[PDB]
């Protein structure tokens, strides 16, 4: 009945398209389009129709009957102007996510993308407001971040993408100022095919690499005079191409960086202070690239020299003195970030111990106190995130100069705890000594300093728990940087982010930090409360205290955070059963008092997880109690149980009926005893027996 109504609706949609088609010819105009008809008014009616249509299209979901409307939609998009064209494109994009790309739209669909590429070079800012960043996101949808649709993307579509490559940055439109949402999309677009390097049989390949060199000129874009940070990741991808490919133009790019350095050389002002900072940005990425990239042969190949960089930083240090109080400020914070970048560039080893001492002075730069060659003279010479960055610079240094000072700096982080700076202190305490971590002691420090630990800081404390907690005192690397790629548009934040826990701990040894996580504790989210345990003995009563914390997890403010399931199972794999059985009985009793199915469901899932993790009969006995629940009426119960039994089998790698004899036996006798309990209080004789037989 809906379909017959739909057929009438499709004819109405066709009539609106026909009115658009007459407009597309631009010649004769039909005398009647109805009522009273205005071409702009018809467009206004159409835009309202499209939003209903987008809901209708998902509802349509008709094979061989949707691409033609989508093919019509690209033509409609050409008729459409700005946002009105964009909303139709968005409706098509949602359809595109469901249908991938229609074969029939073919080149014309590519052409609609091409028209947008033509639009981007010369698009009105008001037109840009009409244009949708989400529509750009749909273009992002068109080429997958990994392979996906882009891997399946047509070679002819790839040629259209190559035409797109000529447009924008090869055009130099990308260098030209653009709306940020469009600019980010352009950076994403280079990333979608070039960064992925997906396919490319359609792509130029060695011819493409020459195009990539043209792309590199495009990559400088505004250059010395957002997406560029995305481009910087993209530039890092170009560096990644140099890595491995060199193993068996970048030097010119280094020369371009040198030219930016030359502008700094002519004057600190002559280098754009932000632009010099931008060149400094991705210098660490350059450090990650090349020899760091080779790490993850001869070493004759040289990464840009740290000493040349240090001289640039020294020029930067002079430039900060040069900057007026009105000057610098947030820009000064960026210069400090570049100094932080230099510390990241140093990575495992500082090029100069003296430079490292200079770096400790640099971390104080704007605000000091607590924990220096300059000493009083540095004070003499002349942000919550900024305080965190200063803390990070101290964090990057371990021991060495001011090793005692670093403990004092941790005290300074304790001394100021507002907003991020309170959060910054919590991060600082966790990373305060790599050496302190290697020795085994209670962490104390900030966690000892505030019982509440803040709320954002408490989330930081959970992150600290991952560094501590399950992770062992012995330290390997002592660096959390690992091999991070790009975290989307997310701020770098902590410098370092990317078998059993970390390189015996009493539950009492966990002490307060273990105490801080609680069912009573707000959580919301449990988040990193699982911490190190979630992600290299004889606890006894202390293990039971840990079990009580696990029981609070079992209550789960969030059923999804119960999270406890599986992560808890891995811990179990690494005496407990009598306590666990008691905990399960308490949970059942709590569930009965609640009389809530959803709470019961969380418990049932937990019970199933405990059985799947368990290699022992007693968890199966716990499963048998669930089977008793299966006998129980009110839904869930056995239908839930049948799924649970299959789940038990999957963990089991069970033999089915052969598994069942092992599964039953004494447990089967327990099942017979449960049937016997039904016999003890039938309250239906044979009728009671028939219900039991159905359970059987």
């Amino acid at each position: 009945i809906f379909g017959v109504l739909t057929k009438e609706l499709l004819q109405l949609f066709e009539d609106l398209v026909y009115l658009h088609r007459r407009n597309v010819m631009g010649h004769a105009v039909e005398w009647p389009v109805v009522q009273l008809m205005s071409m702009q008014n018809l467009e206004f009616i159409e835009v309202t129709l499209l939003m209903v249509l987008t809901r209708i299209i998902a509802i349509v979901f008709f094979r061989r009957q949707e691409l033609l409307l989508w093919q019509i939609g690209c033509v409609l998009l050409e008729y459409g102007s700005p946002k009105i064209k964009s909303l139709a494109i968005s409706f098509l994009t949602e359809l595109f996510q469901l249908g991938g790309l229609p074969a029939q739209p073919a080149s014309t669909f590519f052409s609609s993308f091409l028209e947008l590429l033509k639009h981007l070079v010369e698009m009105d800012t008001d037109q840009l407001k009409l244009y949708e960043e989400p529509l750009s996101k749909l273009i992002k949808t068109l080429f997958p971040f990994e392979a996906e649709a882009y891997r399946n993307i047509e070679p002819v579509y790839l040629n259209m993408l190559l035409e797109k490559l000529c447009v924008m940055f090869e055009d130099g439109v990308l260098m030209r100022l653009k709306s940020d949402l469009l600019k980010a999309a352009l950076c994403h677009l280079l990333q979608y095919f070039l960064k992925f390097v997906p396919a490319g049989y359609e792509s130029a390949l060695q011819v493409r690499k020459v195009y990539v060199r043209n792309i590199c000129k495009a990559l400088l874009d505004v250059l010395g005079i957002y997406l560029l940070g995305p481009l910087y990741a993209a530039l890092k991808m170009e560096s990644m191409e140099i890595i491995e490919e060199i193993q068996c133009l970048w030097s010119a790019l280094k020369q371009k960086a040198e030219s930016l350095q030359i502008s700094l050389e002519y004057s600190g002002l002559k280098n754009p202070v932000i632009e010099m900072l931008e060149g400094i940005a991705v210098v660490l990425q350059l450090t990650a690239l090349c020899t760091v990239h080779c790490s993850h042969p001869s070493v004759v190949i040289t990464w840009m020299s740290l000493d040349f960089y240090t001289k640039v930083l020294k020029s930067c240090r002079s430039l900060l003195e040069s900057v007026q109080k009105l000057d610098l400020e947030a820009t000064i914070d960026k210069v400090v970030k570049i100094y932080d970048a230099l510390i990241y560039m140093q990575v495992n080893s500082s090029f100069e111990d003296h430079i490292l001492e200079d770096l400790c002075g640099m971390l104080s730069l704007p605000w000091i106190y607590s924990h220096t060659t300059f000493a009083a003279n540095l004070l003499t010479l002349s942000s919550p995130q900024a305080q965190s960055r200063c803390v990070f610079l101290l964090t990057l240094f371990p021991r060495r100069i001011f090793l005692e000072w670093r403990t004092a700096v941790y005290n300074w982080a304790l001394q100021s705890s507002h907003e991020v700076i309170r959060a910054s202190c919590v991060s600082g305490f966790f990373i305060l000594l790599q050496q302190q971590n290697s020795c085994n002691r209670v962490p104390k420090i900030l966690i000892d300093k505030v019982k509440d630990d803040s709320d954002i800081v408490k989330k930081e404390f959970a992150s600290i728990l991952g560094q501590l907690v399950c992770t062992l005192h012995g330290m390997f690397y002592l660096t959390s940087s690992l091999t991070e790629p790009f975290s989307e548009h997310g701020h770098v934040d902590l410098f370092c982010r990317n078998s059993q826990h970390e390189c015996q701990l009493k539950a009492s040894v966990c002490k307060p930090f273990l105490f801080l996580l609680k069912k009573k504790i707000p959580s919301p989210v449990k988040l990193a409360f699982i911490d190190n345990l979630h992600h290299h003995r004889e606890d006894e009563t202390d293990v039971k205290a840990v079990l009580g914390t696990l029981l609070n997890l079992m209550e789960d403010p969030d059923k999804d955070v119960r999270a406890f399931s599986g992560n808890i199972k891995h811990i179990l794999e690494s005496f407990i059963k009598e306590l666990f059985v008691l905990r399960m009985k308490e949970a059942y009793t709590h569930a009965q008092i609640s009389r809530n199915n959803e709470l019961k469901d969380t418990l049932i899932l937990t019970t199933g997880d405990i059985g799947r993790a368990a290699k022992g009969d007693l968890v199966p006995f716990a499963l048998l109690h669930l089977l008793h629940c299966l006998l129980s009426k009110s839904a869930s119960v056995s239908g839930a149980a049948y799924t649970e039994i299959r789940a038990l089998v999957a963990a089991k790698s069970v033999k089915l009926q052969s598994f069942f004899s092992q599964y039953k036996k004494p447990i089967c006798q327990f099942l017979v005893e449960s049937l016997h309990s039904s016999q003890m209080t039938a309250l239906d004789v044979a009728h009671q027996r028939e219900m039991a037989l159905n359970t059987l």
């Binding site: 809906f2 379909g3 017959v4 739909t6 066709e14 398209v17 026909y18 088609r21 998902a58 509802i59 979901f61 008709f62 094979r63 061989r64 009957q65 691409l67 033609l68 093919q71 019509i72 996510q97 469901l98 229609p102 074969a103 029939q104 739209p105 073919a106 080149s107 014309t108 590519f110 052409s111 996906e148 047509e154 070679p155 002819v156 040629n159 359609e202 059923k559 999804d560 469901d601 899932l605 839904a635 869930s636 056995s638 239908g639 839930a640 049948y642 799924t643």
Partner: protein
Amino acid sequence: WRQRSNTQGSILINLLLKQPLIPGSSLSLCHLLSSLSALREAQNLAFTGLNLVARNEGGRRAFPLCQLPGAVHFLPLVQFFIGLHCQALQDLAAAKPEDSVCILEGFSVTALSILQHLVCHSGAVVSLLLSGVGGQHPLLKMLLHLLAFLQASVLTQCLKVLVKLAENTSCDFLPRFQCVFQVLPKCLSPETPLPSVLLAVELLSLLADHDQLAPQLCSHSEGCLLLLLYMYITSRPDRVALETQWLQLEQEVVWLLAKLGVQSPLSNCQCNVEVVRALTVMLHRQWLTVRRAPRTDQQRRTVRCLRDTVLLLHGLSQKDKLFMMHCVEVLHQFDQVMPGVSMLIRGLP
């Protein structure tokens, strides 16, 4: 039209030009493109046809496909290549070497798939197929003979070409196509691959296009051809389909199941009983999603799949007079499905 129309044809010519534009093909057109002399004349004609395409740039049209006498001539050259592939298929039946002859037919089949893309690109090639011997095209009839016979993937591609023709094709052309389907249902196999199964779903879309195809129905159970195919869909073993891709083939099947209900015309039917079992298999996928509790495109699809399930649930009650009885066989799954539905309600905005 005008320059834009010329470009679309040129892009279609470009796809033929790429060698092998098809994956797993050393070249497409060119050496692949070329009585042996009659075939050579066809290859020269094909170059001329491409030159003609260069020279010259609502529902029945569907996606507009340019129609050219030259496009028809290129199609005729394609038909000559198809005849060589058709001759290879007859030779393979004679054969009991043969794989190399089959590889040449596969090259042509890849060429046909480019031809199928060309058919989407050009109205004229589709019209010639529509005209038939008098019906299925004699060149089309040879393709049907190939359908009667990597080769299976080529057959799926040919089915895809028929489906592309079908959106372009008139419902009457689909009726001329119909009964190729009667053999096609026999052709479809559990053994045959999931991408081929997606092509079968396209064949189901073709059945909707033709009223006689609509007349063939899942109802009448095993005796009905549709119910047996639906039962295979209901089983959803999806052994060829992998991970999300297995789900995507299932999602296409769900759209096809929805389409029959949308059609006015659409155990008395084996398929309706199979559909309750199929809903349970979808429910098992939903339960895995529920355990995950939609940043992933597949995860977004799963939310879409749950919405499809909600439409399916109204349909499932319609499918079985004993809706409760179908639930009782799938009822333990159905209780899980209700739990999944509650998770879905949280997912729904």
